[PDB]
């Protein structure tokens, strides 16, 4: 009954202030992420994540999701997938040199 337009990590087109406000939520664990729609880029997507540190608190790392002109995506040239979910799974298993392994999603 669900679809790519309503996944556990799909919110739609949100604003920028609300973006850092959803991941910076002090009530969020380190590793939460979300897949919003392109806002300051082409009609692609944007996978943001959350991180913590003993420097000041918790910040947010925005990882723009690339889009292959053929019909796919790849935040990096070494990671291409044919489904926003597939890319969300790889990052949700091996940071592959990322800042953290995707584990939670935006509430």
């Amino acid at each position: 009954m669900d679809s790519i337009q309503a996944e556990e990590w799909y919110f739609g087109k949100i604003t920028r202030r609300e973006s850092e406000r959803l991941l910076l939520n002090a009530e969020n664990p380190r590793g939460t992420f979300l897949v919003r729609e392109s806002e300051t880029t082409k009609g692609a997507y944007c996978l943001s994540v959350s991180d913590f540190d003993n420097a000041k608190g918790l910040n947010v790392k925005h990882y723009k999701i690339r889009k292959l002109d053929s019909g796919g995506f790849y935040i990096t040239s070494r990671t291409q997938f044919n489904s926003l979910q597939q890319l969300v799974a790889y990052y949700s298993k091996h940071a592959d040199g990322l800042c953290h392994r995707l584990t939670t999603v935006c509430p």
């Binding site: 990882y63 935040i75 990322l98």
Partner: peptide, 5 residues
């Protein structure tokens, strides 16, 4: 944003 490196 952040690059995957």
């Amino acid at each position: 944003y952040e690059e995957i490196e």
